[PDB]
Swiss-Prot record, chain B:
Changing residue 284 to L: Abolishes binding to H3K27me3. The chain holds residues 81 to 439 of 441 of the full protein. GO terms for biological process: cellular response to leukemia inhibitory factor; facultative heterochromatin formation; genomic imprinting; heterochromatin formation; negative regulation of DNA-templated transcription; negative regulation of transcription by RNA polymerase II; oligodendrocyte differentiation; regulation of adaxial/abaxial pattern formation. The WD repeat domain mediates recognition of trimethylated histone peptides at the consensus sequence Ala-Arg-Lys-Ser. This is achieved through an aromatic cage encircling the methyllysine, and involving Phe-17, Tyr-68 and Tyr-285. It comes from the Eukaryota. It comes from Homo sapiens. The lineage of its organism: Eukaryota, Metazoa, Chordata, Craniata, Vertebrata. Residues 1-359 are annotated as: Interaction with EZH2. Keywords: Acetylation, Chromatin regulator, Chromosome, Disease variant, Host-virus interaction, Methylation, Nucleus, Phosphoprotein, Repeat, Repressor, Transcription, Transcription regulation, WD repeat. One of its GO terms (molecular function) is enzyme activator activity. The keyword Transcription applies. The modification N6,N6-dimethyllysine is found at residues 117, 188, 204. The modification N6-methyllysine is found at residues 117, 188, 204. This is Polycomb protein EED. The modification N6,N6,N6-trimethyllysine is found at residues 117, 188, 204.
Length: 5, 359
């Protein structure tokens, strides 16, 4: 899971 | 029902990770909200015709600080509002909103602080949740660490969010270990620790104040979400929580008939009462908010769409959804906040923009 796009 | 009346963008161009209206603003005073992002916190005041008036910022001396979260309270002796802020340095700062002076600060956590919450009945009790896997409860009247909630049966990765229930008798926390954990603070042990924190005055004694080390939650589940859990809120005795899987789940510990206050630490079941799906919110650290009365819930997604659910219905799964879009709002919305009178909703974004929606 990433914190930003 | 809402319409977009204004927007602006802050000069730093870094994400705004947090926004909070001050719900302790005096009658007849204009509605004020704080935003946090980059190394700053900024206050604005809402006026007619959509105007969003810039007031003043606090800017941290460390250019490498990044504030993530803020929470309002008031000074219990003077009624004046105070604002707590925290982020990547793991330092909690208590800011006087009038002058933007930092009145005092707390440090403990082994890392970044991901969320701050004040107790719903005691404006002095501040909960912080950390990248170090622990929560800490602080008494900001006596400047004491009351308790640390951690241990190997506590969270095993970053804690991302937490919430007190209505009475402030218990806390639900959630984080990167995919789990949600309940910590009761109305135990004899905890109510005593609170009372002693109020009795503590380092000028009048030789002892340090001893914190409680609470190493066992009163309930734990990893059966709601299958990824990081990044926002949690009590709705009465039910829980609303989200992960980065495009759903908010409404659930409770135990079986359908089980009283929350009868749940034991070994409880293996949960009951799902509903799930609110939406789209394009696959990144973590995306927080929903509710209005003061908990009639409604608002969440933005990673492309600038706002979802608002009406919870004024007989059962959670009957919630009615409304969506709010603007052709110029295209960046990820990190957090929303309603004004105390529910007349304004503010959304803040990864591109440093702020969006005002009037009811």
């Amino acid at each position: 899971a990433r914190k930003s796009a | 029902s809402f319409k977009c009346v204004n927007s602006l963008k802050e000069d730093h161009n870094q994400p705004l990770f947090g926004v909070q209206f001050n719900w302790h603003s005096k009658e007849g005073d204009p509605l004020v909200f704080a935003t946090v992002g980059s190394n700053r916190v900024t206050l604005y005041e809402c006026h007619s015709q959509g105007e969003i008036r810039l007031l003043q910022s606090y800017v941290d001396a460390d250019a490498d600080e990044n504030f993530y979260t803020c929470a309002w309270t008031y000074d219990s002796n003077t009624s004046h509002p105070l604002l707590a802020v925290a982020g990547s340095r793991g330092i909690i700062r208590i800011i006087n909103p009038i002058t933007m002076q930092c009145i005092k600060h707390y440090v403990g956590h082994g890392n970044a602080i991901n969320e701050l919450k004040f107790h719903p009945r005691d404006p002095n009790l501040l909960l912080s949740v950390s990248k170090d896997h622990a929560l800490r409860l602080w008494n900001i009247q006596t400047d004491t660490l009351v308790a640390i909630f951690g241990g190997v049966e506590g969270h095993r990765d970053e804690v991302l969010s937490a919430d007190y229930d209505l009475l402030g008798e218990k806390i639900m926390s959630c984080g990167m270990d995919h789990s949600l954990k309940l910590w009761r603070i109305n135990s004899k042990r905890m109510m005593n620790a609170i009372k002693e924190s109020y009795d503590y005055n380092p000028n009048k004694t030789n002892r340090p104040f001893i914190s409680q080390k609470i190493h066992f939650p009163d309930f734990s589940t990893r059966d709601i979400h299958r990824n990081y859990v990044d926002c949690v809120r009590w709705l009465g005795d039910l829980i609303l929580s989200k992960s980065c899987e495009n759903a908010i789940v409404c659930w409770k510990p135990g079986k359908m008939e089980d009283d929350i206050d009868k749940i034991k630490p070994s409880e293996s079941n949960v009951t799902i009462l509903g799930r609110f799906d939406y789209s394009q919110c696959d990144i973590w650290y995306m927080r929903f908010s509710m209005d003061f009365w908990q009639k409604m819930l608002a969440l933005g997604n990673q492309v600038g769409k706002l979802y608002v659910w009406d919870l004024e219905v007989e059962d959670p799964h009957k919630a009615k959804c409304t969506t709010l879009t603007h052709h110029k709002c295209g960046a990820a919305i990190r957090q929303t906040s309603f004004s105390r009178d529910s007349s304004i909703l503010i959304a803040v974004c990864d591109d440093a923009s702020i969006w005002r929606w009037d009811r």
